[PDB]
């Protein structure tokens, strides 16, 4: 049983906003995880990411319910 | 022969008696084709959707 | 003059019916008014179909609501309530007595006095099964709730002032008015009873 | 009694010639008469280039003739003894002569030299120009005169009968000689013309004189369209002017219509006043009565006025600034009552009234003349006393109620209002004051 | 019955004559009547 | 002379020409002008009375006038300034002799 | 002789409701004046009803209206009328005094003075009215704002412990405000009666602002049959926002019961007191915020006293006109910036907002009126 | 005051139709629509320009404040 | 059935004359010597009074009963005052004659004037005189009569406006208990028999009975600052039964007497040429001729323009010095007699004047005088007595009356 | 402290006129009786609510006899348990607030009566919640207990990821992933707070019609009224 949720959460992560906005995730996630002591975080990055994601998901993943 | 609008006139609209009785008269009808045509337009756009239509599948 | 004034022309805002200068108008006359009353007489039939949803709303709203007719009703199992014995009941914030009778309580109740009673009433119109009782469970004098299986008659008694009640409900020796209060009911199935 | 009364009334007599012209006649052993020429033209033969003409040949009509130039036809009528008088309405222009008995021959030569041989000086033209000039300044003072002209414009706007008598004053101004010889030609022939006379006189004579005088009449064709009625209001204000003028009707049903004697037995019953009327409070007229104890209006009348093939039916009035609204009020009250609810008694009292009012108005050899003369040109005969009263007892509290409710009831009429008129219901006001909300 | 040839007002401004057509007839040559009814109009004649 | 541009400008703008109205006939009735307006002529009061009778008719149809037959900035006559501006006069004497 | 104008009350009816002397003119602002009437009847009707069923007991009272809601028979559409009932009001008061603003209608000082009364017991009502329900931004908002007089030196602190009738907003404040919220309606319907009994003392502005005495109408059937037409379209409103978005003009902190210790994040009153609301917060000092607050509404006691323009309306004046237009924008902007968390750059629009609201009303628009009279040589 | 006592009007004509003879909408688009333009020109930059200014300072300060929430490249 | 009338003088005084036409209509008159001229200085403005009175409660008819009564079927009730006489008329359909019958009885021999209903009935002598004096012909007679005599004739038709409100009901008992009697009365009838208006007079009109006007010549004059100028000059002519007064008659028709062609010139009216030879402009001028029982005033009434008042009234006055100097043809007197002649058979053409001639001839007269012999009395006037009347016109003491704007408007003494 | 604010899904009830999945309201209730109804309570909602919905009278009284709940006092004066009828509401899972927030450690779980009314974004919103618990990002950790949720204020939350893939078995057996047990319980949430939902609806389509059919036919009365007026002509006509 596959969850039609977890299949189009990949359908729409490429595309080119959200292949950009994971890149943009990917570039604080090792500059935090390299350095050592700011206390900087990277909920900004994920939250531009599933924005743009999960506005993609909501137009079709009713479909399939 | 005089024109609908005028044998209107003539025999229901002219003695504001006969005037009155046709409002009432024609309200009872209007109410029971309105209510019914309005309630077949609503249940058509929700097909499927109410307790109305899903009653017969625990009776 | 006065013979120097001329009323203008008024085509552009005239009905089509009343255009030509040459004809009756009183021909259109008969028409022309049944249309601008057609839209009066539609326009009110509209407006009494409207008020009367309003009003019959507004209406309804002061008679009882969905949470009190819930309680308005209390089903009972005749299964679960045994010949000769009683069982209580809480209905409308009251106590309520259904009573199995025996073949002995239906004959002995059946041929007592109607006349020696201080509210003449027989027995096969106090129910509509022979063999079951429905009561309210107040005394009918100032208010106490009977004893089952006690009293001088056989029934209920009341160590309130001093009322004793038969099997069939009816006041015998006491100070009560009334009789013991029969409830509006109806059996459904075999096995249940409906109080309401 | 009255009912034999009626039937031992002179008849009038009927005779043609050959050109058209009608010989119409009722005889009585009188020292005097009346005689005249009765013609169906006025102002609704009248179109808009050539309006007023009718009432400027009536000015010119004794002002000479071909065979008598200048003042001879005057001194001739003055020194005989005899009277020379002519009017015209919309639809009918009139010439006649009150003469002594003996002198008919020479009456009836007398009109026909006037209708016929009408001089029309060029320099008598320029004279009675600035006459009627001075005229339509003299009307213009007369609010009465000026209310009702205003109902008939709007009333039956956009056509001939919308037209005044008179003519707009730029007309009067411009009009020539060759303008009046064409009307004339054109409307006055032996078929639209009808001799009448009463007094002492022979029939036979009378239709002999005809052919003496009246044989070289004229015998493409002047049809009159049917006149447009409109539900409308004018309104002229004027704070200057003490008291306000009001005219209101509804269309009628004209000349010929049956309906017409139902309907004067109502305007009977509603009837008339003024300030002068002896009664006062205990007035039959229930618009009479109220009037005279409030002091609504200074009069009032109804008329029901006849056209063709249509009419104006209704009221006048003449109050105070600040009665306007009241009066219109109980008027428009009167008219419904009527329409729902008539009754017996008060409809016989209307009957008895017209029954009075038009036996007593034929008293005299000119109103009996003007009878026959007007009677051939719009019903085509005299119409017998005896037939008056047999339409009259037909008419009962039924009839008053049906014929009146067909003219008046939920009908849009025609409003004109003169003067200190700020009071003056609004039309709608007016036109909502036609329906009662329980019949 | 029938009314009067002029219905009378108090208070209300007279007809005006400007011509030798319109005067004529008005010069009285006879004593005065006076006469009031129910019905007709009040009048004064020559 | 140099304010004249705007002035022009502004009568337009305001725009109750275009109803066929001068500027006197929008003056605010104060107990001053009410007087002023009871002392006119005939003639002057008839002549306000129609203008305005025909702006608020055109007003309830929500219409102008033809552009033809719109109040000239030039031919705008002050009809009511020497009634008013003695009536003004007349009050500030009376108020003076008060006190 | 009519039974119109003879009967004792019928003359009332007659002289206020159907020949009364109308401007041909008047406009559809003109229809605001008979909308709030139906407004007030609306609220008393549907008010009656809800308080058939409501208690003012602290533990029972946001039980009730849910059950109002739920268990009473259209018990739902009468309390969502109520509400949206409340809303449609203030619409029709804010554009009923905008019609004044422009026309110059505030001349009729005596109108004028008992609209402002009027205005601020409606305020009164509403603000008392949204505490019943018992809700978290009732409560919250009950408190913060009746907590302002605390700032009144000398008597302040012991003023807000009076109203309240206890130490906080409790069972003493909401029983007590149920009185106060059912008695001012009746105050404020004889309040109304008095406006039109000064109204009829000179009859009505038109929007010319010019004398209209040479061209009336008589209100019936003229005015009565348009006053229907605008009566329809108050329903249709009402109505659209009950039957498809009975809660877009509220606040979804009003569904969670009242809880004195848990905070609603952005605390604010309804949307009709929100430009006050800003304008409170313009000033830093908190006294100073409060004088501000009341001089916001009390300043409309003023606007006569700043009229210099020698015409009464705005139709021929295009200065005012735009600064009147600017006036409308800058209270919209004041709604905004009420509703908003207190940050740049939410702090400074707020102040900016507020200093442009009375520089408007002191100063700008009287210069304006002044200049446009030096224009037309006055 | 009533109607009768209002103030003095001279020398004014007024010609009007009942409403059973004349049209309800005579040329209701054909004249209609050009007459609400003409309004519509008339009074736009009085009215419009107020309400760009609030929604320019609207769109400026919500996206001035979402921005300022975000985290300072330092 | 051709029908003539029939005539009875009861031993009482009391004149009955009807005429049986069988007609549809009933007109019945009662003619009373009951004038103006009967008021004394004491009792002015009662006769005017008692003319609107008619409708007020009576003893056998209620005042609502009389209107409503009479309005029921169709008919009328007038009342006419001259200076000399009163004349109380009722017209109906001949089937309820004996119901107005009944009503004119009751009106004029036994009313009962109560007081509320007398002083409630005050206001209405206002309104009445009002509207007559709109006519100025009114001011001028009025005047010219009050000029002209010392006494009787010297009274008005109409209350002076110190008398308005305070006409007892005294007042008006006194004045119909005196003048209302059977040897001041003429009964009138057409269209009813003879005989049973005799039994009606009899039964219910028999009541037991109850100085000369004195000539003065004077002049009044109302300054108005009218653009017109109406007036009136007469001397004292020859009293109504004389033969004398036929020549006055003829006179008045040579000189002109009123108009006869619509909107004409008036070819043979010699005062009218007189005048209009020397003035165009706006004017109208006609012959004067009152008769009365005891005297008479015959001259003429002019109509000019303000400042042309003196020219008219001299050039009309010089046109009747000439026809007494003696410049009068055949030709005139015949065309004056032929327009007499027509007056007076059109003048009782109608019921309603012959009604008013054989009541008028009944009370002046002992019986009437038929249509044939009137005529032939006319033609009895030679040329020569037209030529006296004039000479007696100009050499007789003068009476005037003005009303206008009179500053070109002479006096007597100026003529 | 950024937001996260949700995306509008398109909701069989989303439309003016679009009433609610009644067979979706039936699953949705049983995602609260399996899942929620030991930590949350519901305390508005009666077991008579469901009749006529998304169950039948007989359906409802076998839901109702399936639960304890307290009654009494008793002649004695003693507070007995018994099965539940029709007239019992919901049952509360603790006693009170202060019993709850122990059995979660502080937090105290809402009530989900009114949650879509109280909560902005309302289905939109706690649909989001229940499906988007993700692993934190870099740089971030909050206190043993308090998960990671993006569209919670804060971006911390107090409560366990409460459903995944086959959670319940569902009565009409449809296949029970994660995202269809959020979107029916959302919808039955939906009803919860606003029974009214389809009813208010269907007077919606007739509040439009009658409006559309009175407001041009009040209009055209209005304008032959003023007929009157709007057509009038004026005239000056001085001396
Ligand atoms: C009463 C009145 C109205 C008017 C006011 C309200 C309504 C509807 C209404 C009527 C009454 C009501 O209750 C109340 F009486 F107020 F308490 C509530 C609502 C209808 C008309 N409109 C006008 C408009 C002009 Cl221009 C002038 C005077 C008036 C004018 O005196
Ligand atoms: S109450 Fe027990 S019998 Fe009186």
Redesign the pocket.
Known sequence: LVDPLTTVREQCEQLEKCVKARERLELCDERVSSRSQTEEDCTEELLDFLHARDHCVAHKLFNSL | APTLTARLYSLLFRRTSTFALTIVVGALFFERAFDQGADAIYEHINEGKLWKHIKHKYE | SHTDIKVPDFSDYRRPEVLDSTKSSKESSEARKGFSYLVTATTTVGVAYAAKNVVSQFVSSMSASADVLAMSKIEIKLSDIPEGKNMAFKWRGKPLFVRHRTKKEIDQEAAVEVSQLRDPQHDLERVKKPEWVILIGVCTHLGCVPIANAGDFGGYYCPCHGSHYDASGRIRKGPAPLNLEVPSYEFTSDDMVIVG | TYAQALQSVPETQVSQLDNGLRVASEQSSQPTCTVGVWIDAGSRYESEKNNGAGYFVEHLAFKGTKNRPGNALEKEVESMGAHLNAYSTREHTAYYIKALSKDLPKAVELLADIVQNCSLEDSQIEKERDVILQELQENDTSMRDVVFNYLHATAFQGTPLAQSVEGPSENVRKLSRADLTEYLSRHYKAPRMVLAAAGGLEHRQLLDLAQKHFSGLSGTVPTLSPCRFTGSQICHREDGLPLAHVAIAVEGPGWAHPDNVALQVANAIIGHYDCTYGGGAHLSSPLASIAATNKLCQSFQTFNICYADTGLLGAHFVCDHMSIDDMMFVLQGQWMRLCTSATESEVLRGKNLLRNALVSHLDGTTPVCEDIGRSLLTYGRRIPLAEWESRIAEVDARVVREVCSKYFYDQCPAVAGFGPIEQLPDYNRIRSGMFWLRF | AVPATSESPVLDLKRSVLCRESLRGQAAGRPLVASVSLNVPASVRY | RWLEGIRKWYYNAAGFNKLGLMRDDTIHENDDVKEAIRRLPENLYNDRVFRIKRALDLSMRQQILPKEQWTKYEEDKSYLEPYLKEVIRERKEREEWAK | TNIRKSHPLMKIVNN??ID?P??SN?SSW?NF??????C??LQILTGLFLAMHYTSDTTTAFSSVTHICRDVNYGWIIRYMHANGASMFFICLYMHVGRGLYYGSYTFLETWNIGVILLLTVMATAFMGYVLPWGQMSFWGATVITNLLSAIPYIGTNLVEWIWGGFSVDKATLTRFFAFHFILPFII?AI??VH?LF??ET??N?PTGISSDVDKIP?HPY??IK?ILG?LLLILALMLLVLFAPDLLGDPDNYTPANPLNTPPHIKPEWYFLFAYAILRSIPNKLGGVLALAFSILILALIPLLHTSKQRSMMFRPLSQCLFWALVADLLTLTWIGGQPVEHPYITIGQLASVLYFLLILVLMPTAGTIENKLLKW | RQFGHLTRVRHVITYSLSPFEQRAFPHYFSKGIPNVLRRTRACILRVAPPFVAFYLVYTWGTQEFEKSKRKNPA | HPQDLEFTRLPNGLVIASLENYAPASRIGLFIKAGSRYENSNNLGTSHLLRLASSLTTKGASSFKITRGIEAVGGKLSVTSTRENMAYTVECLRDDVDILMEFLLNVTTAPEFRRWEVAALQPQLRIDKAVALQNPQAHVIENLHAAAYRNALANSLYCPDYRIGKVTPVELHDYVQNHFTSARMALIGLGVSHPVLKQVAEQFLNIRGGAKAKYHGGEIREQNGDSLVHAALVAESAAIGSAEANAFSVLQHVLGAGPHVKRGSNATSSLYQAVAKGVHQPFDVSAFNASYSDSGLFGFYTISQAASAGDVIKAAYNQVKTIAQGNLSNPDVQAAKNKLKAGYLMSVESSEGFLDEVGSQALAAGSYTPPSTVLQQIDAVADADVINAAKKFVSGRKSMAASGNLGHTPFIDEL | DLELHPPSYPWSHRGLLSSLDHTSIRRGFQVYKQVCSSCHSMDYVAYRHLVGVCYTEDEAKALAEEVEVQDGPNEDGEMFMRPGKLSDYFPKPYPNPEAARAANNGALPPDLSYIVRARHGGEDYVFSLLTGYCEPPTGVSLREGLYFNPYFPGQAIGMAPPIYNEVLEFDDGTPATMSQVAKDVCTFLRWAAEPEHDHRKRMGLKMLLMMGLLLPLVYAMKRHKWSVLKSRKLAYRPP
């Not at chain 7, 004046?33 to 139906?38: D, F, K, P, Q, Y």
């Open positions: 206020a409701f009364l109308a401007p008047i003109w004046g008979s909308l709030l009437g139906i007030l009847i319907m109304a009666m039109l109204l009829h009859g009505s038109n209100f005015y009565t006053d009566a």
